[PDB]
Design a protein around this ligand. Structure first.
Ligand SMILES: Nc1nc2c(ncn2[C@@H]2O[C@H](COP(=O)(O)OP(=O)(O)O)[C@@H](O)[C@H]2O)c(=O)[nH]1
Ligand SMILES: [Mg+2]
Length: 156
């Protein structure tokens, strides 16, 4: 077994907490204190390999090995904010090659104001993976966290 320190970042309301709880507790939380910033740990099998994922749900971060950059597809400002978050991540780590994944959450909803090619183009500009998620239906949620872990596995 090996442990992995993941950090979830992004504007408030995008579903950072709902994604972590859905990953950890396999259920959708429609209301979670937006002020609560905590770490949640869980042993998982990723590609036949059992991990311990330690996940800081922001609202410690220096030592994270991988970062989920989350925006909501029904909120362009949260998308416009991604750049600020990637930049601050490179700053905290004093590096430019940090394992990182772009996550478009709430893809269960109509009224999408961020197109898929929009986010894909941004992810390509950063050179990181992009996964569209739904915390409510658990779409792609596993894929998002595992891909980050694969991104970390490549970094080592
Ligand atoms: N429909 C839908 N709602 C979501 C999803 N993820 C989060 N939400 C809602 O968005 C609001 C903010 O979620 P939360 O996890 O607290 O966002 P946070 O501020 O980043 O922690 C909550 O009311 C959630 O119910 C999703 O995938 N689909
Ligand atoms: Mg939260």
């Amino acid at each position: 077994m090996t442990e992995y320190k993941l950090v979830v970042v992004g504007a408030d309301g995008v579903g950072k907490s709902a994604l972590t709880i859905q990953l950890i507790q396999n259920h959708f939380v429609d209301e979670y204190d937006p002020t609560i910033e905590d770490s949640y740990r869980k042993q998982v099998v990723i590609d036949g390999e059992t991990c311990l994922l330690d996940i800081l749900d922001t609202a410690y971060m220096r030592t994270g090995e991988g970062f989920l950059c989350v925006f909501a597809i029904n909120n362009t400002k949260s998308f416009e904010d991604i750049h600020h978050y990637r930049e601050q991540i490179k700053r905290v780590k004093d590096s430019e090659d940090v394992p990182m994944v772009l996550v478009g959450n709430k893809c269960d909803l109509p009224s999408r104001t961020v197109d898929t090619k929009q986010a894909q183009d941004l992810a390509r500009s950063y050179g990181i993976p992009f996964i569209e998620t739904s915390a409510k239906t658990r779409q792609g949620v596993d894929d998002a966290f595992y891909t980050l872990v694969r991104e970390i596995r490549k970094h080592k």
